Amino acid sequence: QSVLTQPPSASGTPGQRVTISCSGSRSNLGRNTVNWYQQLPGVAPKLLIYSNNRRPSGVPDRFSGSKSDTSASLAISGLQSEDEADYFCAAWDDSLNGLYVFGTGTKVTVLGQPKAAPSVTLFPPSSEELQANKATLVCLISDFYPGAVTVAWKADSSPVKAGVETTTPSKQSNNKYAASSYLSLTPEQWKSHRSYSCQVTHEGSTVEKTVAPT
Amino acid sequence: QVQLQESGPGLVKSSETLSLSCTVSGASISNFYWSWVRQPPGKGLEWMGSIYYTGTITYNPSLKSRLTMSVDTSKNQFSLKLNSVTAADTAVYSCAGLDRFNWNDEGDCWGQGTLVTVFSASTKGPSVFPLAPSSTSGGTAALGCLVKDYFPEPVTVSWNSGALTSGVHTFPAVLQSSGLYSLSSVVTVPSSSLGTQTYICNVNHKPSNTKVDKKVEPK
């Protein structure tokens, strides 16, 4: 599939209105309608919105959807604990033989404590890993709340295609969250670029660390 | 009235073929683009592919080398086969009837989802690399060990044979698309101790009967 971009985390207190954006492109949202799904652990996604703004029977009216040209939005008014879940937009995309593309997903949290911004540590590949013909960049992310982030990697200033693996956030002893992300490269890729960056997005913050082979 | 029901082994052997079927009731097999999606634990939703009753198929390009889908109109069923599975294919598999051209008025229909776990008796011991402390002031430095490409869980990491406990932070492992795990353990230490104090990570991976001690030194 492709990429519909969503913020990692949307949060509020009880009764507040939360909104979730979805950013796509000409080939998907430009030419097709959008659906919204509510996703709970261990079960199939539940359809909340189809055809941009229509609710299936049984879905309360406090969920509503809107769609622009290549952007879409889901609004959850009267935030309740029961609404805590992951939410995914999705649209057909006219590329290749036809693809159904899900968004990256947005965790909705009813805030149980103040927000907390992530700390980020980035390690370059070790000389001995490079001696074993491999290269791994390590991005460690700690002390954030709510428990969802996006990790994007850059080579110089361009987003990296492949080789990225990222954990789901896990709760620390102090009830904030931690996660980690790994970028796998050949030694040639590592040595041939000027720099690589780990960029972490969380609520109202972005933190980016950069390392260089020289 | 429309009902989709997934069916197939919930526990499957690695390298063998993962098979699931979906039975459709209350709707004609021609009314939808019949589809499979999956969600590995802790990850996002991934569309696997869609099939129409004529046999037209479109597959996620990241799975097309190992995925086949089929439709049996006399049983009102459709099915997926996923070859050469690893732990990376453990996931909630959900079937659905998707409306390609938004021709049906009620939107798509969804099954219940089923968590399928890929089981393997195989093992692989970790590679261990140092995450060296940079060249740190003022105050504290971070150093650690990267424990890469092992299977199955768990591994345990200690520092200086358990004498070093404060400032230690071992991060839960990532499961890579190869089906192997990796994790990092990092300790924060006084910058003033780097030239003098020895720091050794002790990695134990009992399933492979592997142990590694790695001295983590500056540079």
Side-chain angles (χ1 to χ4, degrees), chain A residues 1 32-33 37 39 44-45 50 54 56 92 94 96-98 100 126 128-129 136 138 140 165 167-168 170 179 182, chain B residues 33 39 42 47 50 58 60-61 94 100 102 105-108 110-112 130 146 148 172 174 177 183-184 186 214:
Chain A
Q1 61 180 61
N32 296 275
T33 57
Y37 302 91
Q39 181 65 69
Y50 68 98
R54 298 192 66 189
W92 283 98
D94 297 354
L96 300 180
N97 295 14
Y100 196 64
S126 57
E128 72 181 56
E129 182 175 27
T136 310
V138 180
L140 306 175
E165 303 283 6
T167 66
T168 197
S170 58
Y182 295 85
Chain B
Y33 213 5
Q39 184 175 23
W47 167 80
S50 296
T58 178
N60 186 319
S94 301
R100 176 62 183 90
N102 307 130
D105 288 327
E106 181 47 49
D108 314 323
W110 281 88
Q112 288 63 240
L146 169 61
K148 188 149 192 71
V174 68
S177 59
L183 71 67
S184 303
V186 175
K214 177 68 65 164

Side-chain angles (χ1 to χ4, degrees), chain A residues 35-113:
Chain A
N35 311 286
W36 291 93
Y37 302 91
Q38 181 186 62
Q39 181 65 69
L40 292 163
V43 298
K46 172 172 182 206
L47 179 67
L48 285 185
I49 295 293
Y50 68 98
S51 190
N52 297 338
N53 61 17
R54 298 192 66 189
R55 278 185 304 272
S57 60
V59 173
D61 52 64
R62 49 196 191 83
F63 299 89
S64 66
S66 62
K67 159 136 180 299
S68 182
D69 48 321
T70 60
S71 302
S73 194
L74 177 71
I76 306 171
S77 65
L79 185 62
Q80 322 181 0
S81 183
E82 291 160 50
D83 302 328
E84 289 188 310
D86 284 1
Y87 292 81
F88 296 83
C89 53
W92 283 98
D93 183 303
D94 297 354
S95 309
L96 300 180
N97 295 14
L99 310 172
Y100 196 64
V101 178
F102 284 101
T104 50
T106 302
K107 182 192 176 84
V108 162
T109 300
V110 174
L111 296 169
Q113 66 198 96

Side-chain angles (χ1 to χ4, degrees), chain B residues 3-5 7 20-30 34 53 70-79 81:
Chain B
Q3 186 173 355
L4 274 56
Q5 184 54 65
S7 184
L20 298 168
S21 75
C22 190
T23 307
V24 177
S25 318
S28 168
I29 199 76
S30 77
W34 299 112
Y53 84 93
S70 61
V71 52
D72 184 353
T73 55
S74 80
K75 288 168 62 192
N76 232 54
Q77 284 189 2
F78 61 102
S79 273
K81 287 187 176 296

